[PDB]
Each structure stands twice: as structure tokens, then as C-alpha cells.
Design a protein around this nucleic acid. Sequence first.
RNA 1: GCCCCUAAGCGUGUGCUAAGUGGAAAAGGAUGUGCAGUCGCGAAGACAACCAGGAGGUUGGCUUAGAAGCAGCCACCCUU
RNA 2: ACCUCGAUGUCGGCUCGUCGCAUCCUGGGGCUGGAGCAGGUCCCAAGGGUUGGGCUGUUCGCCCAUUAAAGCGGCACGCG
Lengths: 192, 133, 37, 126, 136, 23, 176
Amino acid sequence: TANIPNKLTANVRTRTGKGASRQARRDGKVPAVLYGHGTDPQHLELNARDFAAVLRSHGTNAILTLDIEGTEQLALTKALDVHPIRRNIQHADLLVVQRGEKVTVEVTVLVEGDATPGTLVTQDANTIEIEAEALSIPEQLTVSVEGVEAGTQITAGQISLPEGVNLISDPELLVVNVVEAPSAEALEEEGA
Amino acid sequence: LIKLQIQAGQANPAPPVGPALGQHGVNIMEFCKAYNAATESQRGNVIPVEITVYEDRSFTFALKTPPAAKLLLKAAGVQKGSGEPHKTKVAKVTWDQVREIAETKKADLNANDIDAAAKIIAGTARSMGITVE
Amino acid sequence: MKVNPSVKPICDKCRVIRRHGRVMVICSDPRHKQRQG
Amino acid sequence: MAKADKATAVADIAEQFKASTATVVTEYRGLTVANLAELRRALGDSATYTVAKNTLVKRAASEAGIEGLDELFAGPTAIAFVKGEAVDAAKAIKKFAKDNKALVIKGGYMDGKALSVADVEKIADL
Amino acid sequence: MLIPRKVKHRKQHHPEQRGIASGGTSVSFGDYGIQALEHAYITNRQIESARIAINRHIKRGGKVWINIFPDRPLTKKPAETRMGSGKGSPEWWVANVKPGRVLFELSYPDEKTARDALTRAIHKLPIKARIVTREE
Amino acid sequence: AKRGRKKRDRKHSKANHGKRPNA
Amino acid sequence: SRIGKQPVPVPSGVDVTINGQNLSVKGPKGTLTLDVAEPISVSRAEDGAIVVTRPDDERRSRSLHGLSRTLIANLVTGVTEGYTQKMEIFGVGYRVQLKGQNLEFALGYSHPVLIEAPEGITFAVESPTKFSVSGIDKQKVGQISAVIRRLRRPDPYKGKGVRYEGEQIRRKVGKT
RNA sequence: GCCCCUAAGCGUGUGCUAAGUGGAAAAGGAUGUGCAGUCGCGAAGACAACCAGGAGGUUGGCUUAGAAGCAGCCACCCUU
RNA sequence: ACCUCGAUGUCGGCUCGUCGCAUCCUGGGGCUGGAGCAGGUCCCAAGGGUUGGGCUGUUCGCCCAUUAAAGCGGCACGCG
Ligand SMILES: [Mg+2]
Ligand SMILES: [Mg+2]
Ligand SMILES: [Mg+2]
Ligand SMILES: [Mg+2]
Ligand SMILES: [Mg+2]
Ligand SMILES: [Mg+2]
Ligand SMILES: [Mg+2]
Ligand SMILES: [Mg+2]
Ligand SMILES: [Mg+2]
Ligand SMILES: [Mg+2]
Ligand SMILES: [Mg+2]
Ligand SMILES: [Mg+2]
Ligand SMILES: [Mg+2]
Ligand SMILES: [Mg+2]
Ligand SMILES: [Mg+2]
Ligand SMILES: [Mg+2]
Ligand SMILES: [Mg+2]
Ligand SMILES: [Mg+2]
Ligand SMILES: [Mg+2]
Ligand SMILES: [Mg+2]
Ligand SMILES: [Mg+2]
Ligand SMILES: [Mg+2]
Ligand SMILES: [Mg+2]
Ligand SMILES: [Mg+2]
Ligand SMILES: [Mg+2]
Ligand SMILES: [Mg+2]
Ligand SMILES: [Mg+2]
Ligand SMILES: [Mg+2]
Ligand SMILES: [Mg+2]
Ligand SMILES: [Mg+2]
Ligand SMILES: [Mg+2]
Ligand SMILES: [Mg+2]
Ligand SMILES: [Mg+2]
Ligand SMILES: [Mg+2]
Ligand SMILES: [Zn+2]
């Protein structure tokens, strides 16, 4: 499990503020802040479209190599600001990471398969948080449900993980719950 | 050019066949007597019959093997199939009856081998919600 | 000849067209013929 | 159907052709699935009957020297490979065509050569 | 009919329409959801009608979550009454809905019927609404 | 309601700058 | 578009004259005249065809292209061969017969009904229930055929009336 | 504000609009058109058009006067 | 509660009208669970027409004979 850094160009922000931020967003750019253990924050602006393509390809936790005026920097997408309505990316928080470093990351969990036809599958956790090497974080985690009978609970302990990644959250976290399929009359009392 | 399912030892029922055979230009009494003779020779199961018509009102009846549904029902000992297949299991069938019905369907089907017909019968029992063992 | 502010292709045979600035639905089934009025 | 599926089909056709002593190319327009099932019954014991795309076989024909069969791919294409012997499928197709009358024998391939209708009829008599 | 069991004050000012939603802006329970685009009071009976519509379209499987609860009451004076003489009695319960709020959530196997049922729901609401999913 | 609509709509002129007395 | 870039062949006995936008075609069945729209350019392909060209790719030109091409094709095939469309009449007591150029119908009315023959078109009755309409211009033939067809209102129950050659009308049943 | 009434531009450059929209209005309906961006297929010949096929089990069961791929309910398979 | 209290006469009925169309009749259509006769529903259409009496103050309403029909509204709930 090895991931290659994604190449993006960054420009140091001449001016910071809300006016500057709105102008930059209007110019097809996204503002961001790069900070890390080095105790040295930098205010940058990125190309929105390239950044969005990178996120589409490699998820919300993607390793990045940034070209700050000819200097290559390794960074991780620590946080995002997505507008609720327009669903843009208003701001990015990037975390400075070096090779062979352990970081805490929230990785999404998706399910596949076909349980017993008389059952309904519900997902209670969108993501679980994991300790992993900076370049070795997994794109996503999968849980397979098939032949699952009646009330069966899948917890964070039972989920499978790649090699070299450690799960931090308590295994008691109910991720997926398989329940008996609600009957036709069962839908009429909920919400009444 | 029709096909129906009719009881072996019974002839001339009003709902299923009468008006169905009346508007297809088929003589009914000769068909009923010949079919009754054939299915009294068989005497075992209700049968599907396929009717092929000609321009001179001549009719030819083809009698297939007993249906997989009826054969499985009579081999499993139950009378009616499961209303909720794969949820409620009403009967159990062993591989010997499955292979007998597989030979019958090999006489009926296009399956190259007996095992294919056995798998077809197993799928039929799956549509019946009846375990095949 | 339905005359409604909302016209839709009831069956798969229905076609939606425009005639003289009006949205219309034409079909082989005469019931399904309708216009936006 | 994906282009990778097209490549896989080309490879499968080439692999089947490499193990076949001969092949027969015929026309099947005007045949029900019941007729094709009967033909598979007649052929499936020993020979193999298939129908594939013209250009997919054309690319699958570039492997060996059957590249001259491309002119037989104008129109419907039905391939018959002879895994057991070489000419059982020849009589099978000829009788099927004579009985059904909707089959046209485009040609055959044997001994490294492509042969026409009369030539294939003579070969089947051998 | 969703009615709160008890409210501390039975006569309240109108919930304010300013701003856009801050919380509950993303689907969290089910696979699919209805996101609002307009500011409105949504009553309990509109919620009931929309819920019944979803249930009828979906029939057996799947599960429906309602993230909105009508706990804010609105009052009216009795008919043909001149202005004055105190506030009227409260007689319908509403929930304050801002754009970006996710109102309903649905969990059902297939895409098409889920979208159709949600659309049947939106056709019962006094707002512009759209359908959203779990994925970004 | 045409009269009130027309007054409150001519509110929106270039010269009035979006406001008129009596709305 | 797709229709537009297909040049129209000219039969041997066909004379074609282009005068600016105007076009005239003379052949065994007679002469016909057409005019094309300004954005569409018409040219005589020396290999014996007609070429229509639109300089632009905008909506209006792209729409007029195929229109003009098909108009020219119909124009030439009208004079080379012609147009002839056949009609039947269904029902008891429904009949047709010609009075010289005119066509006379008995359609169950109190009075018999008559149709003139407009210029450039002829009627030819074959049997008291089957007749034909022939002309060199497709549009006029279609117009008169539709007028003949509308003579008696649709009858879903018994199917009485005038029908086209292969027309399959919808029918219901009046049970009572 | 600048065609004439009515003082001053039927101003210049690049696009859009066919509705007299401009010169009133909602939920909602819709192959109107322009721009920008994704995904699918496509010369290994794409879509449309024209030709041939779309079978056997089997009428899968429960349900009914009736259930045959086409009230409804459950499973929702196998062979060539 | 914005004009009118140094005065803007109020319900029915009569006489005279005038306008709208959201059409009662007459006219033209589409779909029908439209066989025919007769209907149901929607669309276009304001040219003309749209009765006489008994009871109730009566607005309203019930009823008797008819008629193709006995339309609904605005005009200071038109008009002292
Ligand atoms: Mg509707
Ligand atoms: Mg406030
Ligand atoms: Mg909050
Ligand atoms: Mg939230
Ligand atoms: Mg709505
Ligand atoms: Mg109003
Ligand atoms: Mg105001
Ligand atoms: Mg003046
Ligand atoms: Mg001037
Ligand atoms: Mg200017
Ligand atoms: Mg100018
Ligand atoms: Mg100008
Ligand atoms: Mg200009
Ligand atoms: Mg206007
Ligand atoms: Mg509007
Ligand atoms: Mg809409
Ligand atoms: Mg658009
Ligand atoms: Mg089948
Ligand atoms: Mg049934
Ligand atoms: Mg006052
Ligand atoms: Mg006063
Ligand atoms: Mg005075
Ligand atoms: Mg006075
Ligand atoms: Mg008057
Ligand atoms: Mg009108
Ligand atoms: Mg009428
Ligand atoms: Mg009518
Ligand atoms: Mg009128
Ligand atoms: Mg007049
Ligand atoms: Mg009046
Ligand atoms: Mg009045
Ligand atoms: Mg008055
Ligand atoms: Mg007066
Ligand atoms: Mg008075
Ligand atoms: Zn239709």
C-alpha cells in the first residue's frame, strides 16, 4: 500500500482577509493554510479545479506535493470547508507531513454484497479514525455483507484493515447494523 | 399453436380449455378421448399438452413429461407449494428423486447431461422454497 | 384533448413536441393527446 | 460490451481456432432459437457451433493465415469448428441447410486453404 | 401528527427567517435525503402527508428518518375579531426550516424508487427542495 | 388588486432607486 | 444535415435549369419549378447530380439544408416517374365512380357527394370500392388524398369509410 | 437621460434575446437557445434506419371462477 | 379608519339601460367506461335571445304551466 504524492501548484497569498478570500474564490482559486509540526504557518492559494480533481480521484485524505515557489512540500488534506448550498470548497487546511510519520485520519467505510433478502442494512458510521503512516493511508475501507441473518451487528473491531494501520477508536463503535426488514404495517407507526 | 395444462384423467372442463379450444378451430371430443386414453396409460400426473393446428382444422397434440412443479410436489409429499419460498420451507427432497426427475426432464429438456436437468429441478424447487438434499 | 398546465408522456409511445409555441403531447392512443394551456 | 471484452473474445476465438482442424463459415439469417438449439444438439456432442462479430473474427483471423477469409465476413457469420474429426460438422451443416432452406454455406477452411460452396460439397463427400 | 408533549411557554414569538442553516445540513442516517432551499415554517401535517407519501411509494422495505420536529407553536385569534385583547390561542405547530437543512432521510435498496418516493415527498412541501446523497 | 400592484411595482424605477412613499 | 450532404442523381431524360435561387426541372411527366432559401446554395455537379451547400453550421441553415435537398429529390422523382396513391372504401352501400374528371361517392348520406379534379391531377377508379389518385406533385396528391380520406368521420365500431392502402385503423366495440 | 414628441449618441467593440421578453406574478410543466464542465459508447464501424432471431424447464409457486412473463404476494433460478 | 357628520338619502319593486365572460340556448370542435337516441368532461365562441303566475316583505326560497333557454356578475350591492 504505497501512494504517490499529487502535484499541485500553490501561491503565497499577498493579502489575507474576507475581501481577498472572496476575490480569490471568484478567480477560480481556493484559499488554504499550510501548517504542521514545523511551527510555521503559510497562507496559500490553490487552483480550485485541480484540487477538486485530486479529491475526486483520491478521496478527502489525499497526500499532496505542493510547489511553493520552487520548493516541494509534502502535505495532507487535514480539513475542508464545503458550502452547504453551493457545495464549493471555501477553504483548505493542509498538514505538514514527512515520510515515515504516523498520523490520525478519518477513513470512510463503504459496504457491498447482498444480505438475506428479508433484511435491511443500515450504516451508522460514515467514517472511522485510524493511526497510519503518512504515505500509507488507505483510500477507503470496505465491509462485505452476505448471508447475514436477522439482527447482526458489525462493530469497529470486526472491520478488516490493511497491514501497518492501527485502529484507534474503541471497537464498540457500531458501524453497520443488519435488521429484519420492516413490514408493510411497520412503516405506519414511526413518525405518527 | 397453443399450450395448456390439464388433469390427466379428466376431460372437458369449462373454465380452462373449453372456450380456449373453441376459438382455435380444434375438434374437442376427439382430442378429449385420445388425451384421456393417453393419460390413463400414464395415469400418474396432470400433464401439459401443446396443440398444433393446420389449415384443414386438423389438430396434433403433443404430450410433454409431467411438469417439474407437479413432479417435485408429488416427490416431496406436499400438495401446494410454498407461499413464501426461501423463507418458509415446507418439504425436503433427496438427490434420488432429483435425479429421477432429472432423467424425466432430460427426456423433456435440451440439457446435454443429467446433471444440468438436476440443477434445473433444484432451481424449480428453489422457486418452490423446498430444500434439495 | 387534455388542456393542462402540466403535460407529461403518460406512456412510452407519447412524444413531447412544440407547435406554434405550445408544448404538446402526441401519441397513437387518442387519450394521451394533451396540450399546455 | 467493453473493448477489453472484445480483446478477450478475440483471444478466445483464436484459441478455439488453433485447436480446430477445419472451420465452416455459413449464413443463418431466418432461423429461430429452437432451430439453433437443435443444431447445437446435433453438433455439441463432437463439433462446436458459434456466431461472432465479423470484425472481431477479422482481428482474431490475423493470428494465422486465415486472413484470406475476410471476404466471407460480408453478411451474417456463423462459424463451425471441428474439435472431433474435420467433416462431421460439414455434413451436419449441409443437412441442416437442406432441411431448413434458410441456411447459405458461405465457405470452408481446410488444409490451410479457403474453399467455396461446390468445393466444400465435394470435400464432405470424401 | 407530531406534537410536543409539553412546552415551557405556550405563546411565543415567530421563529425568525434570517440566515441559512448551520446544523443538520448533511445526510447522516439514511442513504438519500431531502435538502431544503427556502426559508419556511413547515407544519406537522405537511410532515405527516410527506411521510405517508414516502411510505406508500416504498411499501415494505427501507426506513424513513424525520430530522425535523414541529415544536414551535403559532396562534390565531378567533374569527371575526377586532384588533386587541391579547394574544390568541395556539393551534398549529411548525418547525423553522432554513436553506441547507436536511428534512427527510430514506434508506432503500434501489436508486430509482428511492428518488421517486423522495420526489413524491417534495411535491407535498411549501419549499423548493433537492435530493442529496451520502457522497460528497 | 391591480392598482396596489401597479403602484408597488412602479416603486422599482431607475429614478426612484427602489423606494417610493407609501411603498 | 445528414440528408443534406447527399447529392441528388439526375436521370438521363431530365433537363435541369438553374436561374440564381430558382430551379426548374423538365421531364417525361412535365415541368416543375422550385425556389430554395437564400442561405442554401444549389449547384450542378458535373457528374450529373445536384449539390446543396450551407456555408454555416448554425441552426437555421442546418435545418434548411435537408429540407431543400429533399424538396429537390421529390422535384425530380415527380417528373421522372410520378406519384400514385391508392384508396379503398369499406362498408355496405359505399361506392365510388367517376363522372369524367370528377369523382362521385355514395357514403350513406342523403345526397351523393362530388369532388372536382384540381389542376395537374387525375382520378382512376379500379373497382367500385378501390380507386387511385395520380399526379406529378407529391404535395398536391397528398392534400387531395387527405381531403378524400376526411370524407366520412372515423368509425371505430364498424369501420365504414374511406381508407388508405395499408392503413390499420384502431377499433373498439360497442357491446350494447 | 441622448430615434421623434423632447435638450443631448437612429455612439463605438464583443456576445445574447424571437418572447414586443424588454413594457406585472406562484407552485409546477417543457427535445427554446448560448456558454462551461463531467460520465458512457464509438472506424475493433458508434446511435438511427433496413433484415434475422427474442427458446426449453414452465402455466416458478400461494392466491383465486381465473393467474398461463403481464389483480396481487413470495422467491425471483437453471440449460442451449 | 384614508375622503365625506357648516348632510355622499338606505333595502326590495318599477322604467331605462350599459359593460365583462367565469356560456343558459343557438354555433364550431377533442376525448369517452361515445353501438344508435340521449349523455359526461374539456376547448373555442359574447352576434342575438333568455316567459307568465301562486305563497313568502322579502335578498333568499318553495311551487304551478311552459320554453331552445328560463345564465352568472360589475356599473354608489347602476338608476328616489
Ligand atoms: Mg396532472
Ligand atoms: Mg432578532
Ligand atoms: Mg447549532
Ligand atoms: Mg449536522
Ligand atoms: Mg414544492
Ligand atoms: Mg388577491
Ligand atoms: Mg412597507
Ligand atoms: Mg409633450
Ligand atoms: Mg433633439
Ligand atoms: Mg448608452
Ligand atoms: Mg446604428
Ligand atoms: Mg446603438
Ligand atoms: Mg451589436
Ligand atoms: Mg410586456
Ligand atoms: Mg413568470
Ligand atoms: Mg420543475
Ligand atoms: Mg438551458
Ligand atoms: Mg422462461
Ligand atoms: Mg398468475
Ligand atoms: Mg378618519
Ligand atoms: Mg357623514
Ligand atoms: Mg357643503
Ligand atoms: Mg338632502
Ligand atoms: Mg340592467
Ligand atoms: Mg371562454
Ligand atoms: Mg355543441
Ligand atoms: Mg362535445
Ligand atoms: Mg353570446
Ligand atoms: Mg357579425
Ligand atoms: Mg346586468
Ligand atoms: Mg345591483
Ligand atoms: Mg344601489
Ligand atoms: Mg340619483
Ligand atoms: Mg329604491
Ligand atoms: Zn401515449
